[model samples]
Target: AKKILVTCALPYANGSIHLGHMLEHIQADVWVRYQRMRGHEVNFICADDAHGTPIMLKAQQLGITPEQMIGEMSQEHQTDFAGFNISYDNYHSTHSEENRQLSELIYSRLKENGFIKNRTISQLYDPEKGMFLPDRFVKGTCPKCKSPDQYGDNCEVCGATYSPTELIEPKSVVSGATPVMRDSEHFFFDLPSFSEMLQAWTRSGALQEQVANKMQEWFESGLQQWDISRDAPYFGFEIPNAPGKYFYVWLDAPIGYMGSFKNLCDKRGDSVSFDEYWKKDSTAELYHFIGKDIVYFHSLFWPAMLEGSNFRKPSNLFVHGYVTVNGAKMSKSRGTFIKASTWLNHFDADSLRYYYTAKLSSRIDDIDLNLEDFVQRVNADIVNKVVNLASRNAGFINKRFDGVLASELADPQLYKTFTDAAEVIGEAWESREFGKAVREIMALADLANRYVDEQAPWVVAKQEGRDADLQAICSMGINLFRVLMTYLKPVLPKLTERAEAFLNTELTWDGIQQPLLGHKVNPFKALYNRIDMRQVEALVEASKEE
Candidate 1:
């Protein structure tokens, strides 16, 4: 067995969990579950990105401390993930003590290695609010086309990029006060120094083709020095020996992965050593699951931060695209911008989990939540196909044979076909071809249903002197269910629980070769029920009301 450490991008603490966030977490959880089934030791870690200008400003508006705001958000975030059965080994926060220590240590090392530089730069300041305004915190007419209400350096009207100071009649977003230019000494990470190192890593075949291509585009544009420190009144960790200056959110946010792991290790005792996992020459494999928009941070800046700090870099980064609803962006007006907590009210977790896993692939392609197609796919593939194998056949064994399966195999050759396909299916999972794995598993479900249809066990039950034949045939169908559920164990966790109880055995990868014969199994309620379009409409209606 191999050691593996995986993490999802930290969820920002300012907002509720939404479907856009669910896509990436579900993708990572599926891969983590698959690795565990193969007998590997995997640590799945994540945390809330709590330290930022946005959070600090919001806390001030709410008349509460930033610590209180992030504490409440952490509970809500974990509740949503737990509802979806995301198996995270540890969930921590970027505002943690461990994060503070690790952030200071990394900054000290980077400064010592000459990768950190201090420069005096002029920035927009809001005198009324007593704070420096970030780029997005200022709004005014665009310099390019004179369009009004353009926020930050990029103008939505003309697609032109310019400095915030270039805007005409700029005002602070917080207090709407006229901004003034102020000069301050701030720290920067010399990203240009690691250009050659990052270029080589990008071409080393450790990333997806789309992400590697994206990195190449960034390289062609030329790397620049990254500002790594924020001024006073920030909620992040203060720089060592630099009073009133804090580390930037982007700098400490990635380090939250290490902070979270180190926290988990402290609780797990010395057997799980943090240094053994993150030292410069550690053999443990590390992977980060992140969104496509943050390629510049995760693929370049994050790796550079670790390399300069004398730590092991990530083995790879799995990047996925944004989520869309009904072939377009999610719209609050259309009630398609669904929240995670709101979903469980209308449908089970497995329904959405199966749908996302069916569409996810190694490529960073967007997954559209087509509500109509979603309703039909879950009903047909999960209820009518996979679950039908057990619900259709278990009755005969329960009524006629006292819940005892037949002592011998009715069709041994048919069973071998299901077992043989495990190789190709497992390979698809290992390659991160989730959609391909779902397709392959569904094909086996079709064959299982077809086998039962050919046997006509319902017809056999009514015939005279066919008791033995009926028991053997129904048991064969039940065994087919055993293997199918084992294949889909990673995608559908809630369903897997119900399946194990009915099968009276735990599903394992290598356990499929040995058939369960002459064993008494328990009966279960409906494994999965069909969902219709009306429930989907109700969910959207609720979102609209909210």
Candidate 2:
């Protein structure tokens, strides 16, 4: 079994968890759960990225301290994740002392290794707010396309990148004041120094093919020195010797991965050593799940920083695209940028989870959530195909045989068919090709349903002498249902819980190898209900922004 550590990118604490955020978390959660079910030792961790100009300004607008704001948001985030069944072993905060300590330690190591340097550069200053404006804090025309209302760092209209100083007629987002150019001495990381190392890492299969191809553009553009310090009035850890200067949020955000695991180690009480997972030569595998938007940070700056600090770099990084609504980007005005809490108010988490798994693949492509398609797919595949097998057969065993399955194998060949597909399905999941895995699972479900149709088990109920055959046929259907549920346990955890109760057995990978013979099962209950369009409409109505 592999010893693995996984992380989803930290969600910023300035807003509620939206479906866009759920894509990455659900993707990672499914992979981690599968590893655990396969009997691997896995530690999954994530945290709230509670610092930055946005959170600081948001707190000021709400008339609370940054700490208070993050505390409240953290609770809401944890609640939202739990509602979606995101099984994070440690859901922590980047505001913890552990993060601060690790950030400073990494910075100190980089500084000692001559990777840190001081530079005086021009930055946008919000005079009204009396602070240096971060990239997101200033907005103006795009330097490349001359598009108005573009962010200081990038243009949403033309997909161009430029510094805040490049923006024309820049204005402060916080106070709407015309910004002035100010020179500040800030610390910078020598990213260009690690260009050769980064180029090799990017091509070393740490990134997806498409993502690596994209990274080639950055390499051709030439790596620049990364500004790693923000001026005062920032909500982050301060530099040791540089008074009134704080570490940029991006510099410390990825370090939260280490800090969160360290916090977990403290909770585990010395049973696990933190260095064992982080040391350069550690045997543990590390993986990161992030959206395509931040691939530059994770692939370039993060790995460079870790290499400079002599820490273990990520073994692999999975990049996924944005979540769209009905073939377009999720828009608040369209009432499609649904919040996690809003969806939970009308639909069960499993429905969305299953829908995502059906559409998700190993590629970095956007997944669209068309309400009509979502409703139909969930009803057809999950409610009717997967769950109907168990519901149709479990009642016969409960009513006629005292909830006990036959002692002998009912259909060993049919059972073997399902078990044999395990290797293929498991490989798909292990490769992160969830759509393929779901397709294979549904194929087996179709076969099992066909077998029930041929046996006509319901017709056998009418004849008194066919009770033994009826028992065998219905038991075969239930066993097939059990196998399907085992393959789906990672994605549909709630359904698996229901199956465990109905079958009276633990849902593990090993359980699929052995058939349940002479076993007594509890009376079956409704595992899932059909999707209702009215509920979806209600959910959309509730998701509308005021």
Candidate 3:
């Protein structure tokens, strides 16, 4: 068994998760689930990014402590994910003792190696609060777009990015006090020092092609020193040696992965060393999935931090684009910003899984959640084309006659057809061409439908001296159903449950190449319900209001 370490970007534990958050989680969840079903030893880990200015400020605004806020949000986040059937092997918090220790270990190693340096920096500070205001704590006009009430990082209106110190007339959200520029000592990670190493890794194909290209573009532009500390009144792991400072949230967030592993090992009584997976030469495969916006951190700073600590860089980074509603960005005013709970309220989780697997490409292209396309594609491919074929046939053979295996068809064409479809579909999945995989699986479904249309199983059951014909049709139906189930186990796990009920045996890739005899089948209902256009419209409308 191959050992794999998979991670998804941790969602900030400030608020409830929406479609954008679920998109990333689901992307990683599907891949992890697929690996498990394929019999690989994979440990999937993620956590709540529980420390950040957003969490602190949001908590303060609600008249609560940061711990209380994170606690509530963390519970909600976990519950919401459970509802959607997101199976996270270990979900942890960044505020745990494990994270605190791990973050300090990374920081101390980097600092001792001279990758971390301290310098005086000018930043927005609130005179009344007597504290340096972090980005989320300050609000001001967008310097570029002149939009009022914008945060320090990016303009909500025009999406122009800027620094908190760059924003004009910045004020602290904590006290609504006008912030003045103040100079203070800040710890900085020297990112430029690792430029050559990153370039070498990119050339060596240790990173995804798209991410490598993006990183190269950024490197060509220039690298900047990254601020790695925050002043007091922040929700984060406190700096070990520096009393009044805290590790930047991002610095501690990734360490949560290690912390989660520690938690998992503790529970299982396993003493596995994390470095064996993350630092060894070739003992493990490390895959990270993140949003496009965070590519710079994951590809550049994250790897630099890892290497500085004598750890291995990630094998590959999968960066995906944003999730859009309709033909444009999701907007609350337009009701296109659907929350996770809202989507789960209306649709089956597996339907969404099938839809994303069939649509996602291993690129940074933004996925449009066009409701019409979602409904049409899911209904046409999964419900009507894929699930319906097996459901319709299995329903007839449930009790019509004692099950008996028919002889393998003597026709070479019949054998070639199944073999070719299986080969193509397997290749697509192995290549990470999930969309192509879905199409190939649908091709098999179509072939099964055509086989039934041509042979007419319903008609064959009524004819004299048709026992052979009856057995042949049942054999083809069961074999076709078995093939679909085997290939689809990754995308539709519940379908496997249904398939097991019908086959009266275990479902595995090994059984797909052959047929079984004298097995009984239960009556199968429609595995997927046909979509209703009205319900689809309502879901779309509800998402828009979110």
Candidate 4:
């Protein structure tokens, strides 16, 4: 079996987990779960990006220590992920000692290899707070259209991009004081020096086509020296020898992937694995699931950092676009910006997971969570299609036949048709074409339902002498459910667990070759139930209030 280590981008600790974050995590979890089903060793890892100016300022505003703030957020993040059934091998923090050590080690290696540069750069500083302000902490009118209250390095209005210092009438977002330009000695990674290596890796035909094309565009535009150090009054790992300087959050953030895996290895007493998976000569595969926004960092700076440090780079990068609600970006005024915790109160985790899986494909296209369509899609697919096979047939087997399935298949050829489909469906999951897999599954569900309708099991039950025929037909329907659930085991995990408990057999990829015969299954109340639009409306209104 092949070994794999997969990671989603570290979620920033300053913000609450939102639906936008869920899209990336769920997509990665689905792939990781599928790899496990296929009998491969997979390490699914992630961590909280618990550093930088924003986090420090947020902790101060909350009247708590940065340590306490990050600890609470890390727990909340893990809780929300657990609620959605994210199967992470380890959830760590960039603020951990593991990260601190790894960060220092990598920086030392880069410095020794002549890949580190020191230079003085001027930035906007808050005199009132006596600290330098990062781009995020400065707000002013947009330099392009003079729009007010714009923050960061780009303008929200007029779609213009410029440096934060270019803002008109810019003031400190923290102390609201007139800021001044101050010079600080900082460290930079020689990213442009590694251009040849990055260009070679990008052309190796390993990444997504869109990602490769995006890299080409950046290469055309040009690469520069990435600032790897931030001045103090920052909340991150301090530079080893340089006083009042800390490693930039982005520099250590990706290393958190390794730090997280290292934490897992140490916790499990797996000394050999930390090198087996990360050393330059190792054979283990590495992958990262990230957003399209951060392609430049992961594609260029990250690989360069690893190469400079003599660590193995990622085998590939899986990038996805943002999550939009109702065909638009999530907005507070429209009540579409749904938080991860807010989602659980209104619906089960399976609802959103199944919906996102059905829309996801092997591309960088954005997935839209249309509330109206979501309500109908889940009810139709989960309630009426897949689950309908077991719910409709299990009752007859339980009540009439003492919970025992028939001795043989009612239609052996039809069962073969379903079993033979495993190859194509397995390939879909392997290739990360999730939408294709879901479509094939639902099509089979439609066929299973058609078979039940044609047999008219209810009419046969009412008759006097068709007891054997009813048993065989209903048993055939339940067997079809067994196969479908096996295929969908990765996507709808909770539903699959419920199905397994009732069938009294675990769903496995290879286990589907043999039909379940003469098997005993327990009774269940409802495999999956329908959801209405009223719940959707209520969820939206609650979002607005929050």
Candidate 5:
């Protein structure tokens, strides 16, 4: 069996977990869970992105050190993720000893290979603050577009990009002082050196088709020298051998994956070196889950760093798209931006997991959680179709027919229906076509609901000497539930427990191959009820606060 190392994008420590953040987590979580169910040896690793300007600003406003702020924020994330039932093997932090060591190791390797260079460049400096202002710290009118209220790097109003020094009348937000130009020697990772390698990798089909095309476009456009170090006052891993300089947050963010592995190694008291996971191709397979926005950094710069250090290049880079609500970007003003905590208080996290799984596709397309559509879909499939099937049938079987599977299926279509559904759903999941997988399950649900309606089992139960007919209906219901439980395990783990109790049978694809002719039925209850519109309205209102 292959050992797979999986990682999702680290949550930014500056804020609480939002639906936007959960998109990638849910995606990665679903994939990992699927692999585990298939009995693969896999380790899921992730960390909090605790460095960068946003985190520093939050710490300053809270009157705490960056480390203290990150500690508290990481705890919140852990709690919220637990509420959402995210099963992470090692959720670590980027601000750790292992992170620093790995950053320095990669840096030293790059320097030794002549890929790192130091050059003096003009940068914005604030006199009153007596410090060099980071790009976000300095804002002014855009020199290119002459747009007011422009950020240091780009003008959102005019869509023009420029350096902070190029902004007119740049002022430091920290001190509110007009900044001046100052020169500093900064280290840069020479990305041009890896242009050929990146281009070749892009054509290798390791990346998704659209992602590969986008990466190819970026490489052909131009490779820029990445500033890998920042001046002092930055909250990040300090550059070794250079006392006052710190590694740029983006430069070390990917290293969080390695830091997590190091932590796992330390906790397990294993002497197996980090080199085995990172450097050797024989021992490890690295998979990165990221959004499309960070494609350039992950696909280009990250691979260059790994190649320079003789580490294994990423085997698979899965890219997902943004999450929108009601077909628009999740915005606070529109009251669609939902926090994970807020959503946790309102509904089952399994619902959200199932919703995303039902809508997600392997291709790069935005997924939207239409509020009304979300509520209707779950209620229609889970509550009305899936849960009701077992709920209605189990009570009848237990009370009357000795709770045993019927001798033979009256409807041959029932067996073919469920078997085909299970097989199709399994294939879709294996191909990462989640949308189709969900449709497969829902289509089976529709068939089951139709069977119940057409068969009219409740009316049949009332007729005299119709126990055998009732047995056939209940038998088909149990079989359908078993089929769904096995296929939906990755999307909703709770369903597995529910299936076990109701059917008194262990759920597996192979186990569902034949009818359970003599199995005793167990008690069952409603798994999910139809959600009231008032509850959804209340949730929407509650999401507006945070």
Candidate 6:
């Protein structure tokens, strides 16, 4: 078993967690839970990205201090995450004192190593708001595609990066007035200094092959010095010896991982040492799960910052694509951008979780949330196939056998088929090919159900002298159901819990090797229900209302 540290990209604190954000967390959580089940030492960490002008301005609009806004949002974030059963060891915040100290520590290290430089840069200033605007704070027509209302940093429609000055008719998001150019002395990180290391790191299997190929474009374009300091009126830690200057949100956002881990270490006491996992050349495995849009920051800037600070770089980065609704980008006006809380209000979280896992694979392809397909898939595969095994067989054992399993296996060969599939399924999970794993599991469930159909246990139940045979047949079905649940334990944790209670045994990988014999279990309960069209309609209606 390896020691692993995993993190999801910190969600911005300005808004509620949406289906887009859930895709990343659920993907990471499934992997982390699987590793833990395999007896590996894993620390899963995440935090709220609680810095930047958007959050500061949002607080102003909400009539609250930035601190108060972040605090309330943090609580809401935790509630939403918990509602979805995200198992974070510590869900921290970038606004924490721990993050402040670590941000300063890393910045100071980079400055000491000559990786930081001073430069005068031009940026868009919102005169009406009396503050300089970040790239996202300005909107205008895209210079490349002529797409309207694109952000200042990159054209969302054309995927082109340019300065805010390049945007045509740019206007400040905070104020309706047009923005004016302003000059400020900013601290820039010498990103070109680490180009060689980053180039090699990008090709070192730390990134997906597609992501690596994409990085070649950036490399050929030449790396530029990154501005590490933002002007004042920002909600972040101030730079030392540089009055009115604060570390940019991007600079401190990734470092929140280290800060969050340090917070966990402090809470756990001297039993766990923070340096053991973060020290350069440490043996522990580090992984970051992020969306494909932020590849440049995570693949280039993050490692450079870590190496300059004498910290270990990430071992691997698992990048995924954004979630689209009904084969299109989620749009608020179109009523497709659904929030996590909105989803929970109308449907169970596991239904969406299972649906996403079925669609997700190792490839960074965009996953579509087609509501029609969602209801049919969940009702057919989960309700009809997986949960039906227990719902059909467990009733027999509970009523006929007084909740007792048979003392001997009726068909050992059938049980072996389910157990043998574990290796292939585990490999799929290990490689992040969860869609393939789900298919394999559902295929096993199909086989088990076929076996029961062939046996015709209900026909045998009516026989005058086949009581023993009926007990053994139903018990075999329950045992096979147990094996399937064990394999699916990581993805369907809630189902696993109910399965354990129904079977009267702990569900684990090893538990699959030995079938329950002479075991007394609780009365069977309905593990899942069929998804209704009305629920999906309700969720969509609620999202539109929001």
Question: What is the C-alpha local distance difference test score of each model?
Answer: 0.93, 0.91, 0.79, 0.94, 0.84, 0.90
How many residue pairs clash per model? Answer: 0, 0, 4, 0, 0, 0
Q: Can you rank all candidates by lDDT, best first?
A: 4, 1, 2, 6, 5, 3
Best by lDDT: 4
Model 6 per-residue lDDT tens digits across residues 1-546:
799999999999988999999999999999999999899989999999999988888899989999999999899999999998999999998988889999999999999999999999787899998899878889998988999999768987879999888999999988878999899999999989999999898778767998999899999999999998988888899999999999999999999999999999888884456898999968999999999999899999999999999999999999999899999999887778999988888888788889899999988999999998999999999888888888888877888888889999999998998899989999999999999999999999999899889999889988898989888988888899899888788888787888898888888887799899998889854789887889887777778889
lDDT of 5: 0.84
All candidates: TM-score:
0.98, 0.95, 0.92, 0.97, 0.94, 0.94
Q: How many backbone clashes does candidate 1 have?
A: 0
Best by TM-score: 1
Worst 10 residues of 6 by lDDT: 267-276
On residues 1-546, what C-alpha lDDT tens digit does candidate 2 reach at each position?
788999999999988999999988998999999999888889999999988888888889999999999999999999999999999999998899999999999999999999999999887788998998878889999888899998769999999898888898889988899999889998999999999998898878757999999999999999999989998898999999889999999999999999999999999895556888999998999999999899999999999999999999999999998999989998777788899988888898899999999889999999999998999999999988899998888888999999988887678998999999999999999989999999999999999999999999889988889988888888888889989999999999888898999999988887888888888999966889887789877877777853
Candidate 6 residue runs with Cα over 4 Å from true position: 135-180
Candidate 2 clashing pairs? Answer: none
Q: Encode model 1's per-residue lDDT on 1-546: one tens digit a residue.
A: 889999999999999999999999999999999999999999999999999899999999999999999999999999999999999999999999999999999999999999999999999999999899999999999988999999999899899999999999999999999999999999999999999999999999989999999999999999999999999989999998999999999999999999999999988885547998999989999999999888889999999999999999999999998999999989999999999999999998899989998999899999988999999899899999999999999988998999999998799999999999999898888888999999989998999889899989989999999999999999999999999899899999999999999999999999999989989999888888899999999999999988
Tell me how far candidate 6 lies from the true structure as C-alpha RMSD in angstroms: 2.7
- Where does model 4 exceed 4 Å of error? 140-170
Candidate 5 lDDT, 285-380, residue by residue in tens: 789989989988899999999898878889879999999998999888677898998888888888889889888988989999988988898888
Among all windows of 10 consecutive residues in model 2, the one with the lowest summed lDDT is 537-546
The C-alpha stretches of model 2 lying farther than 4 A from their native spots are 135-178
Residue 450, candidate 4: Cα error in Å is 1.1
Q: How close is candidate 4 to the true structure, as a TM-score?
A: 0.97
Q: lDDT tens string, model 3, 1-546?
A: 788888888888877888888778877877877778668889988889998777777787799999998888889998888876778889889989888888999999999999998999888888998888768778999998888999769898999887887787888888889999899888998989998988888788756688788878998999988999998877888887798898998888887887887777778888655657766475788888899999998888898888898877787888888989777888887777888888888887777778777877677888788888888888888777767666666644555555444556523466457766766776666555778888788887888788777888788777878867766676666777677877887777676777787677777765665665555556655666887778876876776665
